[model samples]
Target: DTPDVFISYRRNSGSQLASLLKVHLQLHGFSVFIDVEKLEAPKFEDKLIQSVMGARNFVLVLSPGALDKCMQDHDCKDWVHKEIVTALSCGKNIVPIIDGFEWPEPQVLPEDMQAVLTFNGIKWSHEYQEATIEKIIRFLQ
Candidate 1:
C-alpha cells in the first residue's frame, strides 16, 4: 500500500528521530515510509523514487549536519539533495523536521535549495518529542 508520509533523513544524523517518528506516526494511523526499514535490494533509487512519489507528505529530518553533508559531499548528486528536489518536482508537501540546529540562512544555500528556506520547519527536541510529534501530525492532517 502507498504510504501517507515519506520520512527523509541522513542515516547518521536523523536516525533516532526518524525511527521514533515512523513508529509513532504509524500508531496514529498514518502509513509512513522510512528508508532503513522499508527499502531493500536492487534498484534502491528507483524504489526510493517510487516511495516518494506515492506519499503525500515528505518529512525531512534536518539535523545539524544534514545540509553540510549535502553541500560538501557531492552537490546536486547527494541523496538528500536528490530526494528534496524530487519531492519538490512532485509537488508534495515538504516539511523540515528541524533538530540539532537552526535552519540555514537563505543566502548561504544553493539557488535550487533556496526555496527550502521558505518552508516553515518543525523544530524537534527530545524533551518535547510528544508535543513535536503531535504538531507534525496536525501539520500532516
Candidate 2:
C-alpha cells in the first residue's frame, strides 16, 4: 500500500523477471512489493490485493503465465484484474509491462484492462529493456 509499484506476475513462468524488476525498482528508491518476495503464505493474497488497491501505480508483468492467469485461470478478474480495473476506473495510473509474449486478444482482458492495450502497448526484450523502462517510468510520472 505504501509502495510506488505493485508487481503482478505469475510465480512459475515469470519469477526471474519479477525478481529483476523488484531489484531495479528498489535500487531506484521506489518502494516495491512483488508477490513472491513479500508473500509467504495464504495471507499474502489478502495483502497483495490490499497493496494493489492502495499503491500509487500498478505494473502488470505480462508473460505467458500472466496471460494464462488473465485468460484461463480468471484469477485476474478476481484480484489483480479487479484491483487494476477499480484503479483505472477511478483514473488511477497503470503501466502494463508487456514482456516478449504475444499480446492477448482484447477478449482475454477484462473490459477495463482492454483500454490499456488499446494504445501502443509497451513490450519488453533484452535489447529494449532500458528504453522501455524509461518510457514506462515517464508514463507513470
Candidate 3:
C-alpha cells in the first residue's frame, strides 16, 4: 500500500503551510492528502474518510484559527476542532505539526489527546522550515 499522510488544517491560517508540506512529501516520493490537494472532488467527505483511514500518519496543522475555534463558537462545532477530535478517535498514527503563534497544551487540547505528550512538534520561526521539512520527510520515509 502507498504511504499516505492525512493533513488537517484551517483554510485561513494553514493554507500555505499545508501546501508546502504537500510539496515536500511529493518531492520526497511519498503520497500525501493535504486538504488543498484532495478537496476538489464531489464526495469530499468520503474521500477524507478514506484518506484518514488509509494514511500512515495524520498531520494536524494546529494554528491559531484552530485553537480559536475551541472557544469562539458556543457549540465547538468548528471544522478544525472537529477534525482533530475525529482524527484522534479514528485510531490512525497521528503526527501533529503545531503552527502559528501558539501551540496547544495537552490540557487545552481535546480530551482524547490529553495523553499525547507530543505530536511531532515544530515552532513558528522561519529558520525551522528546512529542519521541519527534514523531520517530515523522515516520517514519510
lDDT tens string, model 1, 1-141?
A: 478999889887888888888998988889998887423233434323667878889999987778875663334655676677678778788888888766667666656656766777888878888888899988883
**Better candidate number, 2 or 3, judged by lDDT:** 2
Assess every candidate by TM-score. Answer: 0.82, 0.72, 0.68
The residue-by-residue lDDT of candidate 3 on 1-141, one tens digit each, is 335787777788888887787777788677887655434334334223555666777777766656655543324345555555556667666666766546545565555445333566655346677777777656542
Backbone clashes in model 1: 0
lDDT by residue for model 2 (90-111), tens:
4657777767767767876655
Better of 1 and 3 by TM-score: 1
RMSD of each: 3.4, 3.9, 4.5
User: What lDDT score belongs to each candidate, Candidate 1 first?
Assistant: 0.76, 0.65, 0.62
Candidate 1 — what's its lDDT?
Answer: 0.76
Number of colliding residue pairs in model 3: 0
Question: Ten consecutive residues with minimal summed lDDT in candidate 2?
Answer: 39-48
Superior candidate under lDDT, 1 versus 2: 1
| Candidate 1 error regions (>4 Å) | 37-48, 72-75
In model 2, which runs have C-alpha deviations exceeding 4 angstroms?
A: 37-48, 72-79, 111-113, 127-129
